[PDB]
Write a protein that binds this ligand. Sequence first.
Ligand SMILES: *[C@@H]1O[C@H](CO)[C@@H](O)[C@H](O)[C@H]1NC(C)=O
Ligand SMILES: *[C@@H]1O[C@H](CO)[C@@H](O)[C@H](O)[C@H]1NC(C)=O
Length: 148
Amino acid sequence: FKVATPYSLYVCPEGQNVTLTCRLLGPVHDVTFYKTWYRSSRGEVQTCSERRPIRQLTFQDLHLHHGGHQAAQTSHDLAQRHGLESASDHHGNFSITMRNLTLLDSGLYCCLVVEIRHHHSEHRVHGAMELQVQTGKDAPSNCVVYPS
Ligand SMILES: *[C@@H]1O[C@H](CO)[C@@H](O)[C@H](O)[C@H]1NC(C)=O
Ligand SMILES: *[C@@H]1O[C@H](CO)[C@@H](O)[C@H](O)[C@H]1NC(C)=O
C-alpha cells in the first residue's frame, strides 16, 4: 500500500485546532500496524528521515500499535496534557489533532505506517505535509488547506 496525503499545506492562525490526515491507499488477523507522527524536514535525497518532537513529545510517545481488525486512539492523558490526539480508524484514515495552536507548532509533519506480520516488516511508508501557524494581521480566520 501507499500513503496518500490529501493536503500538503495547512495554514492556521494561532489558537485554532487542526487535524492533519494521512490515508492508506491500495491493498491493506495476525497482522499489526505501527503508526506514529513526528516533525522532520525535506532533505536533499531524504524526506521524513530524521524524527523531531511534536510539542516536546517524540514519535515513541505518540505511536499507536494495533491489529488489522482494530481502530486505536492515543490516551486521554496525552490529550489533556499536551493537546494532541492521534487516531486510526478501520478504513485507512490516520490523523493527529492538535489543540490550541501556537507559532512553535509550525513545521513539516510526517505520518509513518509500518505493517508487521510475524515480527517481519513488510511495508514501511510515510507521508509529509507542512503546517504553518500564522500570527497577526494576515493570518486567516481559521485553517486554510491546500491539496497536494
Ligand atoms: C478546540 O478543541 C477544544 C476541545 O479539546 C474545544 O474546547 C475548543 O473550543 C476548540 N477551539 C476552537 C477554536 O474551535
Ligand atoms: C486550550 O485553551 C483553552 C482556552 O481557550 C483552555 O480552556 C483549554 O483547556 C486548552 N486546552 C489544552 C489542551 O491546553
